[PDB]
Amino acid sequence: MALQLAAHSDARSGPVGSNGGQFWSFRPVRPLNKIVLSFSGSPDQTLNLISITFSSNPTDIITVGGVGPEPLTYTETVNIDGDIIEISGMIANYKGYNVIRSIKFTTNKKEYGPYGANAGTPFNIKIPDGNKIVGFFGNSGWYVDAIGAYYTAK
Amino acid sequence: MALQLAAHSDARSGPVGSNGGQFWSFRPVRPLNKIVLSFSGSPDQTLNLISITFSSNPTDIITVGGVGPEPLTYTETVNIDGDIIEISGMIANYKGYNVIRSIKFTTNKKEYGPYGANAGTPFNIKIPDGNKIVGFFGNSGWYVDAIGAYYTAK
Amino acid sequence: MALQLAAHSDARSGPVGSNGGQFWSFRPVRPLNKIVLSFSGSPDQTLNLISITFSSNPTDIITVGGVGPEPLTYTETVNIDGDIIEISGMIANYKGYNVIRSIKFTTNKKEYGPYGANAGTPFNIKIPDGNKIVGFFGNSGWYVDAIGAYYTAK
Amino acid sequence: MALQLAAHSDARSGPVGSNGGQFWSFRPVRPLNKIVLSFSGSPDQTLNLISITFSSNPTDIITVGGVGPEPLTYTETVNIDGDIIEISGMIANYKGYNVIRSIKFTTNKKEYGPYGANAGTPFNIKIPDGNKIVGFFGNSGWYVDAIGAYYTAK
Ligand SMILES: CO[C@H]1O[C@H](CO)[C@H](O)[C@H](O)[C@H]1O
Ligand SMILES: CO[C@H]1O[C@H](CO)[C@H](O)[C@H](O)[C@H]1O
Ligand SMILES: CO[C@H]1O[C@H](CO)[C@H](O)[C@H](O)[C@H]1O
Ligand SMILES: CO[C@H]1O[C@H](CO)[C@H](O)[C@H](O)[C@H]1O
């Protein structure tokens, strides 16, 4: 007595960047409210993006990249106001791997970034008008190798 | 030299049914305009769905199911008028496997079906208002084991 | 001129269950090592699965289901030993929705469950030999409507 | 009654390229064994990849790109022997869009190509050892904007 009412999966945009050790995915039920970027290096010189931590209130969270031995030295915290609708950045070599090196998040009312080392090959994830980004997925290893987003209407 | 503008993949609904021998996927760039359902048995008795052939003019086409030796004895040709917005049917046993046994296609203009043996466990692939089905995917072997749909805004 | 070295997304199994309010996805880069199932009702009587919390050390976590007004009364904490290789359970109606009602996790070393109300329509998420489940996805609302898994070799 | 034996969807690699008008997908149940690349331009000067026709000759076929007004002037027909294990090529601007401009296919038996214009930025779809490409997906419009592959073991 159980009708098979097909369950849905959100549209995807990307991934951009490069193949990495592990596929990762994080689409939480509630909106993303915070993104922490972790780096090695320093702002006065060059920041090396190593991992990204995505979270949604009150406790959903995931960290991708950062599984290597390099110690972190800096972090940038992005407090998301509203729905993300676009992301951009640069891809370039880091210790033998082409990785996400800088990232910028854009919502309906504000832009955050770009943060990191903004040099390299640009990437841009954009979605249809009237849609929102509701999660991210990609590949990662010691660093963040590729990134894509889940999106849906309204 | 070339912006990595993330490319999109349409949302999915399903699949419903059962795991089968091969995954299959068909999402043409022009509308799906014809579907041929091939069966063994008799329309005057019981029809057994063996394969489905989806096509989009001028020459896009795919057949899933039917790789077994059983001869086909009857076909139902469905000429699609309008956007497909819903699919439903029944899943039941056929020669050792739970398979898609009947299927009904609903568009914004007409309803087609159910075609086949309308007995078993019901399935229904429904999408949000304002969207349309633009492709199908599933699993198949000798028969049609599972089916799901790709959908996007109209 | 970063090479576009196509990045991979793991093979998927499912989902099973039914369409729900939101799509959710959680595939961490480290192994899933803990799953908390939250229920209303009681073990001595009938346990009603409401939400599931998946986590991977040290800090990855996600909770799906549980959005509604019903208070939680019991939880089953599963400490996963080994790679998850199979999941099974039952789907049945709960307050007007067909939902995941029980779930059993099988790793290469032990099995856990089934936990919940083991009655209704059985489901089984199986993968090819030599593979392991590395994440889960599905639909959820007030309850856990559908679930599927990400899997990969080894 | 029907046991919900979760059905599987093959792993994906990509897409590489750029977002385009429509998502397309083709994963036939029989091995892909024919690919036709259609161009405008001159084999001596520069070829402009307009569309690609993939087939599981002779039953399954799809053509992506080429829905615009530009006439084709030259085609490359590729008869694949064995399993495709890798593809690579260049991406570059064509009349306002960054599109797939050349492609080279590698099977366990031999190499095919490159076919197209050798200029732009490179892409490469590689898969795990012991796997094979069993389908393709991407974005397209007047041209082939993005491409990715479905792969599985064996
Ligand atoms: C140091 O190698 C590891 O990290 C890099 C960069 O992130 C890649 O992901 C690679 O596949 C993984 O094995
Ligand atoms: C006859 O077996 C074959 O066809 C059935 C039914 O379609 C399933 O797909 C199975 O996995 C496949 O090996
Ligand atoms: C009370 O409705 C909500 O919860 C149910 C059950 O979980 C479904 O998810 C539904 O789509 C969602 O809107
Ligand atoms: C001429 O525009 C059309 O073709 C280009 C190139 O293929 C892109 O697909 C674009 O989105 C589509 O509208």
Side-chain angles (χ1 to χ4, degrees):
Chain A
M1 280 42 175
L3 160 78
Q4 291 188 33
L5 221 204
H8 72 278
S9 298
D10 298 331
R12 304 165 99 220
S13 177
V16 296
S18 306
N19 194 60
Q22 304 287 315
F23 166 68
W24 53 269
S25 184
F26 185 70
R27 202 290 206 190
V29 165
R30 290 292 186 192
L32 291 155
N33 73 95
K34 190 173 65 191
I35 300 172
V36 177
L37 310 173
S38 298
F39 307 92
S40 77
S42 80
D44 24 85
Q45 304 320 299
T46 296
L47 287 172
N48 306 305
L49 180 62
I50 287 168
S51 74
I52 297 176
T53 294
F54 298 97
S55 60
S56 174
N57 293 326
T59 53
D60 294 346
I61 182 168
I62 197 183
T63 293
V64 301
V67 183
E70 171 147 27
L72 304 174
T73 58
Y74 195 88
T75 68
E76 181 68 55
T77 300
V78 186
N79 302 286
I80 307 302
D81 307 292
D83 298 308
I84 294 166
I85 57 179
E86 167 183 356
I87 283 100
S88 55
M90 295 290 214
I91 288 152
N93 162 75
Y94 184 64
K95 286 178 172 55
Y97 294 87
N98 281 329
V99 307
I100 305 297
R101 294 278 290 168
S102 72
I103 188 160
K104 177 174 181 183
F105 302 92
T106 299
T107 65
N108 321 257
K109 73 284 285 165
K110 287 189 281 191
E111 290 163 50
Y112 307 88
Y115 305 103
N118 194 228
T121 297
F123 69 83
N124 189 7
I125 296 173
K126 292 170 167 288
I127 60 175
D129 279 343
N131 283 69
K132 45 174 184 180
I133 284 182
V134 287
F136 288 99
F137 64 92
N139 280 187
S140 66
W142 286 17
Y143 319 126
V144 181
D145 310 305
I147 180 157
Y150 292 109
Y151 66 96
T152 190
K154 141 263 228 72
Chain B
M1 161 132 222
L3 169 69
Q4 290 188 30
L5 181 66
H8 68 282
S9 301
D10 296 336
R12 298 157 89 265
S13 177
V16 292
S18 321
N19 195 65
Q22 292 291 319
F23 164 65
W24 54 266
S25 183
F26 184 73
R27 200 297 203 187
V29 300
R30 296 191 192 272
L32 274 161
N33 39 243
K34 182 205 287 180
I35 305 177
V36 178
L37 303 171
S38 302
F39 311 81
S40 62
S42 168
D44 298 303
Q45 290 282 46
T46 299
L47 280 171
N48 308 301
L49 183 62
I50 297 300
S51 64
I52 298 176
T53 295
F54 299 103
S55 62
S56 162
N57 295 315
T59 62
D60 292 353
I61 187 178
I62 192 183
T63 295
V64 303
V67 308
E70 176 163 22
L72 304 175
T73 55
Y74 177 80
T75 66
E76 191 72 58
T77 296
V78 187
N79 291 286
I80 303 294
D81 185 13
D83 305 317
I84 297 178
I85 59 188
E86 178 183 347
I87 285 109
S88 60
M90 292 292 209
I91 288 155
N93 173 81
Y94 182 66
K95 294 192 176 171
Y97 295 90
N98 282 331
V99 308
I100 300 303
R101 290 277 290 175
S102 69
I103 189 162
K104 174 175 183 177
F105 299 97
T106 296
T107 70
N108 63 309
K109 311 288 294 319
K110 300 282 290 198
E111 269 171 33
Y112 303 89
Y115 300 110
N118 206 48
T121 294
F123 68 84
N124 193 12
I125 296 174
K126 274 181 149 300
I127 63 181
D129 177 29
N131 293 71
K132 65 180 169 183
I133 285 172
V134 283
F136 292 92
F137 65 90
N139 279 190
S140 68
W142 279 20
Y143 317 126
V144 182
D145 309 301
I147 192 171
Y150 295 104
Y151 65 96
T152 189
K154 290 182 180 202
Chain C
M1 305 273 212
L3 167 66
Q4 298 185 33
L5 210 218
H8 73 284
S9 304
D10 301 334
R12 303 166 269 182
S13 177
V16 294
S18 308
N19 199 60
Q22 299 292 145
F23 164 66
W24 54 265
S25 181
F26 183 71
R27 198 295 203 196
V29 304
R30 303 179 212 256
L32 278 158
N33 34 55
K34 182 194 289 179
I35 302 180
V36 180
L37 306 179
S38 306
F39 308 89
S40 68
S42 72
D44 287 349
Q45 323 294 131
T46 308
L47 281 175
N48 308 303
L49 184 62
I50 302 297
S51 67
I52 300 180
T53 300
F54 296 103
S55 59
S56 176
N57 290 137
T59 43
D60 298 348
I61 180 164
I62 201 191
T63 295
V64 294
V67 165
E70 170 161 20
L72 299 181
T73 54
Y74 187 76
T75 61
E76 186 68 51
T77 48
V78 185
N79 292 289
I80 305 297
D81 183 23
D83 304 320
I84 302 182
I85 61 158
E86 183 161 340
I87 285 115
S88 64
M90 296 283 217
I91 290 155
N93 203 89
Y94 183 61
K95 300 194 175 159
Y97 288 95
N98 285 322
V99 313
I100 302 302
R101 291 277 288 174
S102 61
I103 186 159
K104 177 179 173 182
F105 301 96
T106 297
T107 64
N108 62 310
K109 319 225 306 211
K110 316 192 160 303
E111 28 175 15
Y112 306 91
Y115 304 114
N118 207 54
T121 296
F123 68 85
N124 192 349
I125 292 170
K126 285 197 215 268
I127 62 180
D129 300 349
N131 287 77
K132 55 177 176 174
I133 288 175
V134 282
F136 292 99
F137 65 89
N139 283 185
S140 66
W142 283 19
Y143 322 115
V144 181
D145 310 301
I147 189 163
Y150 290 108
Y151 63 97
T152 192
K154 272 45 254 99
Chain D
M1 315 87 71
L3 157 68
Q4 287 186 31
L5 218 203
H8 77 279
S9 298
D10 298 335
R12 297 167 274 182
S13 175
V16 294
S18 314
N19 192 59
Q22 296 288 320
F23 167 62
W24 55 265
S25 177
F26 181 71
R27 198 302 202 186
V29 300
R30 321 75 158 52
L32 276 150
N33 57 12
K34 189 178 173 190
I35 301 182
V36 172
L37 311 157
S38 308
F39 304 89
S40 60
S42 301
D44 29 306
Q45 304 188 197
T46 83
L47 290 173
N48 309 300
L49 181 58
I50 297 296
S51 66
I52 302 176
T53 299
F54 292 101
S55 56
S56 264
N57 205 37
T59 55
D60 311 294
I61 313 164
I62 191 172
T63 295
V64 296
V67 310
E70 188 171 355
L72 305 169
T73 59
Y74 179 67
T75 59
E76 283 271 20
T77 291
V78 185
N79 290 294
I80 307 306
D81 181 22
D83 304 308
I84 298 175
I85 57 174
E86 176 178 339
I87 71 161
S88 64
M90 304 303 282
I91 286 149
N93 164 70
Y94 183 59
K95 300 190 165 168
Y97 294 92
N98 283 327
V99 308
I100 304 304
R101 299 273 297 171
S102 73
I103 194 152
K104 167 172 176 180
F105 303 94
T106 296
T107 68
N108 60 110
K109 310 281 165 48
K110 53 149 48 193
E111 285 152 285
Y112 298 87
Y115 305 107
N118 173 59
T121 200
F123 67 86
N124 189 22
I125 293 174
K126 284 169 61 188
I127 68 191
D129 291 345
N131 284 63
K132 48 173 176 182
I133 286 174
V134 291
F136 290 98
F137 66 91
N139 280 187
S140 67
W142 282 17
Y143 324 119
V144 188
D145 307 297
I147 185 172
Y150 292 113
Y151 67 91
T152 195
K154 211 154 60 265

